[PDB]
Design a protein around this ligand. Sequence first.
Ligand SMILES: C#Cc1cccc(CCNC(=O)CSc2nc3c(N)ncnc3n2[C@@H]2O[C@H](CN=[N+]=[N-])[C@@H](O)[C@H]2O)c1
Ligand SMILES: C#Cc1cccc(CCNC(=O)CSc2nc3c(N)ncnc3n2[C@@H]2O[C@H](CN=[N+]=[N-])[C@@H](O)[C@H]2O)c1
Ligand SMILES: C#Cc1cccc(CCNC(=O)CSc2nc3c(N)ncnc3n2[C@@H]2O[C@H](CN=[N+]=[N-])[C@@H](O)[C@H]2O)c1
Ligand SMILES: C#Cc1cccc(CCNC(=O)CSc2nc3c(N)ncnc3n2[C@@H]2O[C@H](CN=[N+]=[N-])[C@@H](O)[C@H]2O)c1
Lengths: 263, 262, 260, 245
Amino acid sequence: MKYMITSKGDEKSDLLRLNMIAGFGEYDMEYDDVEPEIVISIGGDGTFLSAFHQYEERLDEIAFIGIHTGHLGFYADWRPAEADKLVKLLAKGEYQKVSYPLLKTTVKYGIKKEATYLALNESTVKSSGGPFVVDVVINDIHFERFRGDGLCMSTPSGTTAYNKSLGGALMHPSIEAMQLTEMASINNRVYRTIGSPLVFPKHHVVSLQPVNDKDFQISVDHLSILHRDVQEIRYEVSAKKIHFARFRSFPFWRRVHDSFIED
Amino acid sequence: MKYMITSKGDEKSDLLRLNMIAGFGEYDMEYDDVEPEIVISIGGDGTFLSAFHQYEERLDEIAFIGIHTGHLGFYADWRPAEADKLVKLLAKGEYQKVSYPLLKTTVKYKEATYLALNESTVKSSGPFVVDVVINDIHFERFRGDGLCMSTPSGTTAYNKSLGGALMHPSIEAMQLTEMASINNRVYRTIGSPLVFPKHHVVSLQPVNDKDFQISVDHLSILHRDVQEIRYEVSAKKIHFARFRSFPFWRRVHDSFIEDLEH
Amino acid sequence: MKYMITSKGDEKSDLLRLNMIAGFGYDMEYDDVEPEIVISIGGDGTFLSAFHQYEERLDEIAFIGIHTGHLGFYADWRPAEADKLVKLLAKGEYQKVSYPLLKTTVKYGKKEATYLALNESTVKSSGGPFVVDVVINDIHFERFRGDGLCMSTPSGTTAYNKSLGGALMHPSIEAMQLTEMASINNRVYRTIGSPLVFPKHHVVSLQPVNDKDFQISVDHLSILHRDVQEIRYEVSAKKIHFARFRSFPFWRRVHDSFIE
Amino acid sequence: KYMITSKGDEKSDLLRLNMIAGYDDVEPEIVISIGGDGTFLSAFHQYEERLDEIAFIGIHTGHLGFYADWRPAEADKLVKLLAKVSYPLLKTTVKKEATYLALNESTVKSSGGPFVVDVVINDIHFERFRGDGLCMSTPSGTTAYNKSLGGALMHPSIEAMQLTEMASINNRVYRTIGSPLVFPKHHVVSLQPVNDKDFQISVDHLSILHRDVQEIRYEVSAKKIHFARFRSFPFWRRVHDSFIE
Ligand SMILES: C#Cc1cccc(CCNC(=O)CSc2nc3c(N)ncnc3n2[C@@H]2O[C@H](CN=[N+]=[N-])[C@@H](O)[C@H]2O)c1
Ligand SMILES: C#Cc1cccc(CCNC(=O)CSc2nc3c(N)ncnc3n2[C@@H]2O[C@H](CN=[N+]=[N-])[C@@H](O)[C@H]2O)c1
Ligand SMILES: C#Cc1cccc(CCNC(=O)CSc2nc3c(N)ncnc3n2[C@@H]2O[C@H](CN=[N+]=[N-])[C@@H](O)[C@H]2O)c1
Ligand SMILES: C#Cc1cccc(CCNC(=O)CSc2nc3c(N)ncnc3n2[C@@H]2O[C@H](CN=[N+]=[N-])[C@@H](O)[C@H]2O)c1
């Protein structure tokens, strides 16, 4: 079927790419980077993030596959020296499809219109100059007034990323939820924050509303653009999910174990 | 229908209790402390925990309701000066039923199963050294005070104090947090709290010591000659009686951030 | 004597400024070149500016902070006490409390640039990952990877340091505290995790790994330093002087900020 | 005028006799601890009144400790060299006043249910605590229980003490600081009960049950522990080799 492959940039990844495209020529595999059904990322998790946003409009018809040319990643689980068996399994169509939840980021302005974003790892909101002060509104109800560096809403699969370094909890990707973590909160008598990471289920909306400043630095999967005149930033579990092609069994907790503890 | 009421022990809880039994005599409510359908807890969260474990065998037919005589609790959501409206609403039978997930604690050596509403902790008796096994696979070797497996509703309890995350009770999962773990060259732990979904089993296995103190929601028992302590999301769920809308996040807000109208 | 006053920018600070400057019209001469008493009106951020404005003549200046807004750790005196301050600052009836400072030294591939910190000095990246080697007293300690590192002053512990999970140190202690900023604690970059408090004559040297362009921030100024070879941290011999009139305990000031 | 303390095992007892050949256990000037840090604490508490006249030396028969710095199979050179670094200590007073001396730290937890006290710093109320307990640590004891509780690691050349929280609920009624607190010399931290007055007071895990407690005072002790320095093992290296491998 219609597949494609993205490469990191180094010689090792570009070399492995051509050999797989060749391999896919021995079967009924058509190379198409416009309407693919299988997107293969070769490199790392950062490379995988690029391949995700490259096809965020066609997430429903694409099963992603990651290959790490360096160290083991949470999205790139396949070793380079396993690409032959990967090609054969991807030719017969002998694989199941596992789906991970995603984060929907909506930013509102002083109405130009509305900007929606999709996060695989997480979405963060910081300031653009001095202090970052917003009001956290959970389900149309005020929860706290934040003051610090920013806030980080993470995906279940993104919990092992920026979320963990910020003190967040590690959630299994089978759980459809989102986790909110604080970034250097001052937490005083005026700006009293919960401190603890917050895990929100489906259909729960976390609305960030400005206080004195409306210029924020919104980052989604490390794409960080400056949004001016912001009126509202909404977080919620997107109905859209990213699909993975499962062949073998690489448990999430083992992948966490092999990454943070020891391999 | 068949109801009952548990009391803390002080006069404030005991006085308010009788006043509800009286009010409920004006309706078709049969007072039964053996086989109730609606259990009312008066006191605090600790009192509510007692009401849960007192009738954990008949969770299937019981809708729990909590009343706090002191400060606002996460299970005791109803204020004393609202007890008048509760009997009226609970007599007509006009209420919805919200269910929260529970934690199943299994100990092996006679195998002992326990059910947790808040959380379950495992400590030593000197040093506490165990092996954390996730789904029949080794994850880490723990060394510290102990480990805490929490329920979503129990995240706002001991879990929060240990630096754990606050999880919404609509999520069927369980959270594992560390209790003062040492992180040196020999015992590298994950550090971060771990949230496990359903059908995921976290097994704690002893190393060079077999005497641990297992604690289950406001309890504490000494288990001797322990070979395995298994954790998993229980199939059993606790049922609450809903009349109005008191969001989970509001009870978190009113507890830790501020309560400006009180 | 030779004094001066800096203002935050809002109407409250400029109004309070003029009202105090008049008040002194005693043997008080307004001088912004060689002052002996610098009064900051606004907030802690305003006070930091007044510190860096006269970081060259720190031995002859006793600072006084007035907060027009919420209570600060440097601007501790309330506006409705500016009346008595003028009289007390006229007799010369005051004692002198000194707080430690942080010395930041940067080396290139050239010379070297030294900086003075009242709150703290942080070193982050300029784009992607921040990877450096933490060297304590010419000895390797760890290889860090995350957002950055924060070396704080005792008086600056109640600022960014606390938000990063750092410990609160009393300003009577001559030391410095190093805290981590979202460090990835994995198998390759194993960091200590816990904040590190270093005494006097102890040098913490941050040395680059693959990148040599860092965003070095001192207190309130954050500039981008290219071709960085070494960043050294140590407790500076220079100290900031305060004019103490009444008794406002440090822990009491911490209580009033975070607990009430 | 020296002496040697042993862990209890044969390996330590064997090494003990071999060093004795190379003695006063009433008026010693040089104390050698053979075993571990826990064993080292016993040798410390055994002579806390004459700490001013004793230079301590630790030898680990097991893993490397922060107090047991000397290797067992290199102890041969030690007798010749033994023929001065000072670390701060913690003073714990319980209210008739009962004084205690801590090398690592002194902790206070409950004895049944909740642990609720009022933290009073220099005769001034700071916060009302509610949780498992509180931990006041020495600079040298920061690498012990203090670190596990999320405390900061301070160098032993600093004369101070660090207070860390143990599972604080930290809510709107019991608002705690959260951050570890470092107090200098002549600073007194007074812990005062609310309802229950029976707590488990622990000094170097010498946990005794104190009934009818009215006040628990913490302050940097004037007495300091002395070590016999022969080589140079930096504190941060000792931290490095332990946690960073
Ligand atoms: C891995 C990595 C990485 C990549 C770039 C930059 C950094 C340090 C500065 N980080 C940022 O400015 C935000 S992104 C980030 N920070 C952190 C952080 N401190 N500890 C863990 N992981 C982080 N992420 C992950 O970086 C990823 C961006 N993609 N890449 N490479 C995001 O998706 C986050 O998951 C770390
Ligand atoms: C609140 C706030 C605030 C103020 C200015 C800027 C920001 C966003 C990012 N902050 C920084 O990059 C460092 S400055 C800073 N951030 C923080 C921080 N997130 N939480 C606490 N306190 C901070 N300081 C204190 O601000 C001082 C400088 N400006 N002021 N005031 C610095 O010394 C810090 O100690 C937040
Ligand atoms: C209530 C209570 C309570 C409060 C403070 C201290 C203690 C004794 C030290 N903690 C324990 O032994 C475990 S129970 C516990 N500790 C903690 C804790 N430190 N901070 C918050 N909440 C805790 N829980 C919660 O209390 C619940 C009620 N138990 N009681 N009493 C227990 O299920 C825990 O969820 C019990
Ligand atoms: C590993 C371990 C360990 C050691 C002792 C006890 C325990 C189980 C429950 N916790 C306690 O009993 C508290 S005593 C303690 N725990 C810890 C701790 N987790 N990590 C560092 N250090 C501690 N201290 C220190 O060790 C020394 C106690 N004796 N020993 N060994 C004392 O100085 C304490 O300050 C676990």
